[PDB]
Amino acid sequence: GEIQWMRPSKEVGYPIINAPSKTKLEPSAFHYVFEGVKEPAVLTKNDPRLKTDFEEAIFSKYVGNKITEVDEYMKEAVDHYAGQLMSLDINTEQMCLEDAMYGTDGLEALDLSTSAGYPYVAMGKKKRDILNKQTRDTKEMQKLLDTYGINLPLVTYVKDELRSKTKVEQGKSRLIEASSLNDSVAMRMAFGNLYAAFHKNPGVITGSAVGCDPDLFWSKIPVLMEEKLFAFDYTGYDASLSPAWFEALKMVLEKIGFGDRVDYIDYLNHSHHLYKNKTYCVKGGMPSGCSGTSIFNSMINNLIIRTLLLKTYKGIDLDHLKMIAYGDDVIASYPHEVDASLLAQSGKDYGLTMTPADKSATFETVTWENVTFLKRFFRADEKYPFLIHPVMPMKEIHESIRWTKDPRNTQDHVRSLCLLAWHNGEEEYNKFLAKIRSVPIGRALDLPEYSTLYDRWLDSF
Ligand SMILES: O=c1ccn([C@@H]2O[C@H](COP(=O)(O)OP(=O)(O)OP(=O)(O)O)[C@@H](O)[C@H]2O)c(=O)[nH]1
Ligand code: NA
């Protein structure tokens, strides 16, 4: 990923974009009842907490484009992955505007809470308008697709969320590159069934985990993996992607019946962005707020791991590479041990910065005891060991519960945390509930007891 040029949006006929300057995150009723060290992320250059320029920091994620062409290894990776996806009979048909907007089996309806994007954000019009849950009115939308047409600019927003102190002092705030409602609808029509196929098949055939339900899926993973597990973290995955990785992605799409509309991939790759008063053009880099970002990032991860393996171990048998990705997160396996540190080295050559799994200091062996996927561990249940517990650390839950963005959603926010929390065991869960109930707001909440959660879990399989 690399910014080719940036300049004043007025110079090119674009309206300044208004983004709230104040966070919506305030201490919650549980702020002092639990521990935590995270604060809201910097949303402006004027934040007293800053210890370096904001703009330089938020955009430093674009480390550049390391590779230019798709080499021999990448091409092989493409053939293999595309070969696997082939076995899913993915329906190559387009998706009718109705299903793309209000969803169908395998695909959820569009989310009304996220930015409608340009030009709407600058016109003040929102999603509530165009979309009618019970109506299913294509008309208004359909009309808009002719008036403004696809392939429109991406509105860049600073993600309003909790970050470590360092990420606050270093302006390391994440940005949200939002796509126009028009594009989201288009792509969902173009790829709609690809998404559904992926959502309906989390595992090692799609090599994807998007759309999965951790409570059920965790018990299926161990069986799918090969003997030896390997993993690693990516630093700035999305922004590090070079155009070549997008071409490889198009080759996969073409090979499975979507060559028809691989142009859509070109806009993710070479893209136009609006941020505040400035406008910029980026070469490479997966935008964080487009339709499919998650799935396309996972597909690219499947090509990356394959590529690094072929480049480092001539003779490797990709048929026994069992991996599952969720964007940049990944959990992989092979019948034989491999040198992650070595693989990370080849990774640099492809423009990927890979480091020991879970901020380790060195690349150590990956086990079912220390491996994490989506910040969650895998823990077999005491009573019935064949059922696996996705275990989110309590630290994560503690940090989250200490803040709020809307007191109206306190019931839902805490309930959600409870559904992640109990997998840590009855003792821990009850200590968690106790503290929640040690202040008025908590005592008024309708929270599930351990037993109720555990019994429900057992019956869900
Ligand atoms: O809206 C956004 C923007 C960015 N991101 C994602 O955040 C990642 C970079 O944002 P982080 O600051 O969390 O990235 P990191 O993974 O590079 O941090 P390290 O562990 O290496 O210290 C990028 O790889 C992108 O995918 C989102 O998930 N959503
Ligand atoms: Na891009």
Question: 361 and 387 in one domain?
Answer: no
Question: 327 and 403 in one domain?
Answer: no
* CA of 187 relative to ligand 2 center, distance in Å: 16
Question: 358 and 304 in one domain?
Answer: yes
Question: 232 and 263 in one domain?
Answer: no
Question: 231 and 180 in one domain?
Answer: no
| Alpha-carbon span 43 to 51, nearest angstrom | 14
| Alpha-carbon span 120 to 122, nearest angstrom | 5
- Provide the CATH number for the domain around residue 450: 1.20.960.20
* CA of 70 relative to ligand 2 center, distance in Å: 17
**Cβ neighbours around 242 below 10 Å, total:** 25
How many residues in the chain?
461
For residue 149, how far is the Cα from the chain centroid? 27
Domain contains 74: yes
The answer to whether the CB of 17 falls within 8 A of the CB of 115 is: no
**Nearest residue by C-alpha to atom 4 in ligand 1:** 174
The answer to whether the CB of 114 falls within 8 A of the CB of 105 is: no
- Provide the CATH number for the domain around residue 330: 3.30.70.270
| Alpha-carbon span 35 to 269, nearest angstrom | 41
The answer to whether the CB of 69 falls within 8 A of the CB of 244 is: yes
* CA of 177 relative to ligand 2 center, distance in Å: 10
What string of H, E and C letters represents the secondary structure of the chain?
CEEEEEEECCCCCCCCCCCCCCCCCEECCCCCCCCCCCEECCCCCCCCCCCCCHHHHHCCCCCCCCCCCCCHHHHHHHHHHHHHHHCCCCCCCCCCHHHHHHCECCECCCCCCCCCCCCHHHHCCCHHHHCCCCCCCHHHHHHHHHHCCCCCCEEEEECCCEECHHHHHCCCCCEEEECCHHHHHHHHHHHHHHHHHHHHCCECCCCECCCCCHHHHCCCHHHHCCCEEECEEECCHHHHCCHHHHHHHHHHHHHHHHHHHCHHHHHHHEEEEEECCEEEEEECCCCCECCCHHHHHHHHHHHHHHHHHHHHCCCCCHHHCEEEEECCEEEEEECCCCCHHHHHHHHHHCCCCEEECCCCCCCCCECCCCCCECCEEEEECCCCCCCEEEECCHHHHHHHHCEECCHHHHHHHHHHHHHHHHHHCHHHHHHHHHHHCCCHHHHCCCCCCHHHHHHHHHHHC
- Pick from 339, 367, 395: which residue ends a domain? 367
Cis peptide bond prior to 119, omega within 30° of 0: yes
Number of folded domains that form the chain: 3
What string of H, E and C letters represents the secondary structure of 47-110?
CCCCCCCHHHHHCCCCCCCCCCCCCHHHHHHHHHHHHHHHCCCCCCCCCCHHHHHHCECCECCC
**Nearest residue by C-alpha to atom 23 in ligand 1:** 236
Range of the structural domain that residue 235 is part of: 213-242+292-367
Tell me the sheet residues that pair with 331.
324
Q: Which of 157, 166, 174, 291 best tests ligand 1's pocket when mutated (most atoms within 8 Å of CB)? A: 174
Question: 273 and 171 in one domain?
Answer: yes
| Alpha-carbon span 341 to 317, nearest angstrom | 20
Question: 330 and 432 in one domain?
Answer: no
| Alpha-carbon span 170 to 191, nearest angstrom | 38
CA–CA distances in Å: residue 113 to residues 160, 213, 230, 300: 14, 22, 37, 28
**Nearest residue by C-alpha to atom 28 in ligand 1:** 288
Task: Please give the span between the terminal C-alpha atoms of the chain, in angstroms, as a whole number.
Answer: 42
The answer to whether the CB of 294 falls within 8 A of the CB of 210 is: yes
Return the structure tokens found at 328. 């940049």
Residues 6+ apart with CB under 8 A from 442: 29, 30, 33, 414, 435, 436
| Alpha-carbon span 15 to 124, nearest angstrom | 12
Question: 259 and 302 in one domain?
Answer: no
Ligand 1 atom closest to Cα of 286? 26
Return the structure tokens found at 88. 């899913």
Residues 6+ apart with CB under 8 A from 407: none
- Which own/partner pairs from 375-380 qualify as long-range (CB within 8 Å, at least 24 positions apart)? 376/214, 376/218, 378/218, 378/221, 378/222, 379/423
Return the structure tokens found at 52. 């370096």
| Alpha-carbon span 393 to 266, nearest angstrom | 39
The answer to whether the Cα torsion of 76, 78, 82, 85 is positive or negative is: positive
Q: Which of 238, 240, 326 best tests ligand 1's pocket when mutated (most atoms within 8 Å of CB)? A: 238
Closest Cα partner for 428 from 395, 457, 400, 402?
A: 395
Resolution in units of Å: 2.3
- Pick from 234, 258, 284: which residue ends a domain? 284
Domain contains 42: no
